[PDB]
């Protein structure tokens, strides 16, 4: 439901952002005020990633 998959690689630009790899699964906690950033959890930790870089799976 909040289970997602990464569409593209994203390299953390610091400031509480999280690196993710295409194909990786994430759990989504929420979004920032404009929906552009998504706060997510993966095996590598927790942080903000682009909302457009991920999508629900299953």
């Amino acid at each position: 439901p909040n289970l997602f998959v990464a569409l593209y690689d994203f390299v953390a630009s610091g400031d509480n952002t999280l690196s993710i790899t295409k194909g990786e699964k994430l759990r989504v906690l929420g979004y920032n005020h404009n929906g552009e950033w998504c706060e997510a959890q993966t095996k590598n930790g927790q942080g903000w990633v682009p909302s457009n870089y991920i999508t629900p799976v299953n």
């Binding site: 509480n16 552009e36 903000w48």
Partner: peptide, 10 residues
């Protein structure tokens, strides 16, 4: 969340 915009997807 970051104050700047995220990169656009490709």
């Amino acid at each position: 969340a970051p104050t700047y915009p995220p990169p656009p997807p490709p």
